[PDB]
Scaffold this active site. Structure first.
Site, PDB file in Angstrom:
ATOM      1  N   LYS B  63     -81.367 -40.103  10.815  1.00 41.73           N
ATOM      2  CA  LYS B  63     -80.824 -38.824  10.326  1.00 41.73           C
ATOM      3  C   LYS B  63     -81.879 -37.778   9.929  1.00 41.73           C
ATOM      4  CE  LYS B  63     -79.047 -40.921   6.689  1.00 41.73           C
ATOM      5  NZ  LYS B  63     -79.212 -41.500   5.331  1.00 41.73           N
ATOM      6  N   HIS B 181     -78.929 -47.122  -2.907  1.00 42.64           N
ATOM      7  CA  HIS B 181     -79.793 -45.990  -2.572  1.00 42.64           C
ATOM      8  C   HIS B 181     -80.168 -45.199  -3.833  1.00 42.64           C
ATOM      9  CE1 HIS B 181     -81.579 -43.521   0.735  1.00 42.64           C
ATOM     10  NE2 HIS B 181     -81.602 -42.632  -0.243  1.00 42.64           N
ATOM     11  N   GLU B 258     -84.484 -48.261   3.938  1.00 38.86           N
ATOM     12  CA  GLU B 258     -84.092 -47.230   4.882  1.00 38.86           C
ATOM     13  C   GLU B 258     -84.975 -45.986   4.659  1.00 38.86           C
ATOM     14  OE1 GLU B 258     -80.118 -46.463   3.277  1.00 38.86           O
ATOM     15  OE2 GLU B 258     -79.155 -48.276   4.100  1.00 38.86           O
TER      16      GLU B 258
END
Lengths: 392, 392
Positions: B63, B181, B258
């Site tokens: 992304k 996250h 990530e």
């Protein structure tokens, strides 16, 4: 065509097609967000524009909704066009619009693009800095400049305007007139009157130093939907007087405007699909739809839009609403469409409608997170196409 | 290749090529903004990631910078990938990355995209809502789910996590583990420790109901430049302990992360050109450059970036600075890059440099107002390429 243009049968309206297309997909899958763009609604607007400001030639602000169908429809009607980049100019020209119908309105143009415009017959440009003028002398000395006054990133004040005109004389560049921009967050109609009054003044300032000025550009900022407090015609009520006052037609002036949102806002409806859901304590709902603030709703940031979610499914006659928020599809915690609203419990698969989504929506959407620009379905009635012929 | 990849000669750095390329275009202008993407910088980062978190497999957040060269370079290195849409999955796969190396991390997926993922061998996905699960049952029942916890749009709390695991049992969906996250606006390193501590708890919760969970995904939010206060390694200082404490390796756990901004932020420099200028009373300057908040700088809105304008022209040894603001090239009054800064008087033609522009910049840029995405020049040193081989 290079666009999906369909003709509405007798009693069908744009919203009926939308209603139809969501229904004729409910089998299988693939409930991707889509627009229904009623090109008729654009004609209606042009026509209505001729009625309201009959002195004022409209020059559509391409920037607003750059879609090939919108520009081709408008072109056919005989509007002028407001381009701000080489690529906007190319678009318009690639639809066979002659250059006389283009105004390069961006007041701070990159020189190579000025050059592009000069090698392609685009004479009328806009400015508001002395540097701008120096650029124009170098790159496009035969150009017809419109001085853009204030009403902030753009707008020369009256003191600068005096100094610009003089600096434009020693440079031997032609200033054919004055342009202002009110802005969409325009509450007072007086603002127009004021600005026209200031423009009349620069016209005078300009003749004093021997400029034979014939052009008044009144910008845009006209609303594009009935769902605003200050309505279109209400604004034209306080303009026509102010124009007839400071710019009577026997003075041979030519008046133009740069409308964008006005033509296209209401012409587009957006159907998005509720793709996920969360229940929080069953008290409040969070719904996730498949278009975000990185896509069509980017406007809630850049254009300061307030969007109203509509139920595609005709609501039940009293049904129990809940506090709901709508979200976009991205991994962006900040990608949130409606922070709080009032809705029936809805379901994954249900579609939501967003009315008036033409202006400054698809045109500033990016495919962040890999999410696709929603597919646009152009539609036009029998009547509508008749009317588009009369204009040809 | 389908991308402009060049090999730096002996003593050439990325910045030297930028300096070179701006100098090679000083005649017949056309001074469009461009990026210099040092792919060597990316390698450096992966190498340094291996040293810092030697337990943790990095799954690049596509992304963040979806460029084909970035993905291909990383793929070649053996990173995993974090995709959030069908289209992200396709890109990755179109570069020969097997599906075992992909995690569909978007916690609220549209059903057809789940279906895409399911028909393409992508087994690991993320979730945090009971509805999500129902989707997964219907669409991808063999999937390996990662439960995403809270540390707000995403994140199941510990109460929800207990209920989700139960509901995932009655559904016969496998939950292989947990993800959290932290976020880029992460000030405290403690947040990691806390979140690992919570994730350890969910692993326990999960075993209680007979889930044989083997996966911890620690998210991203790692900084991509030295020019931040809390530095990369500092964060890894407080993670390695936390991990070794709650997730010792004899427990056969597998740890992933990530990262996005970490790999690419510093790898890209942006050269924009000052294309207009205004003088306000010669006291303060306004400079207009040819990229805006609708293009690369969209991040100052969506990503909350603060950008530092750099002079391409080596500055004079004491020169008199002025209060200057920088603006983008659109007709948008709100299109402003730097609201106020300190700069030498500069000229139309001068270039300004923007360092650390890799992350969440090009990927969310739209071509509003018809302005083009800046051209990207990929570069890689001799050394760099050597090192990309070893990883093959």
């Amino acid at each position: 065509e290079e666009f999906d243009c369909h003709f509405l049968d007798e009693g069908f309206t744009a919203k009926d097609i939308l209603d139809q297309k969501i229904n004729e997909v409910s089998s299988s899958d693939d409930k991707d967000a889509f627009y229904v763009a009623d090109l008729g609604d654009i004609l209606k607007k042009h026509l209505r524009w001729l009625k309201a400001l009959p002195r004022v030639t409209p020059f559509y602000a391409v920037k607003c909704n750059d879609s090939k169908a919108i520009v081709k429809t408008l072109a056919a009607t005989g509007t002028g066009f407001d381009c701000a980049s080489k690529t906007e100019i190319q678009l318009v020209q690639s639809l066979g619009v002659p250059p006389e119908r283009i105004i390069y309105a961006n007041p701070c143009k990159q020189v190579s693009q000025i050059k592009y415009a000069a090698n392609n017959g685009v004479q009328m440009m806009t400015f508001d800095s002395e540097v701008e003028l120096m650029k124009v002398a170098r790159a496009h000395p035969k150009a017809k400049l419109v001085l853009r006054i204030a009403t902030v990133k753009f707008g020369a004040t009256l003191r600068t305007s005096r100094l610009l005109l003089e600096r434009a004389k020693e440079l031997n560049i032609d200033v054919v007139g004055v342009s202002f921009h009110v802005g969409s967050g325009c509450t007072d109609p007086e603002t127009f009157v004021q600005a026209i009054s200031d423009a009349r003044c620069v016209f005078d300032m300009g003749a004093e130093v021997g400029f034979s000025m014939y052009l008044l550009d009144i910008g845009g900022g006209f609303p594009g939907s009935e769902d605003v407090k200050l309505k279109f015609e209400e604004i034209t009520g306080v303009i026509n007087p102010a124009l007839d006052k400071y710019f009577p037609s026997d003075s041979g002036v030519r008046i133009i405007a740069e409308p964008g949102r006005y033509y296209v806002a209401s012409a587009f409806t957006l159907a998005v699909n509720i793709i996920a859901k969360k229940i929080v304590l069953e008290q409040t709902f969070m719904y996730y739809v498949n278009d975000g603030v990185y896509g069509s709703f980017n406007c809630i940031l850049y254009d300061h839009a307030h969007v109203k979610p509509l139920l595609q499914k005709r609501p039940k006659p009293d049904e129990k609403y809940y506090s709901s928020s709508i979200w976009g599809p991205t991994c962006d915690g900040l990608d949130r469409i409606v922070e709080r609203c009032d809705l029936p419990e809805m379901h994954v698969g249900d579609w939501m409608l967003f009315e008036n989504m033409g202006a400054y929506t698809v045109a500033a959407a990016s495919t962040f997170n890999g999410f696709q620009r929603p597919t646009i379905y152009y539609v036009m009635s029998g009547p509508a196409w008749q009317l588009m012929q009369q204009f040809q």
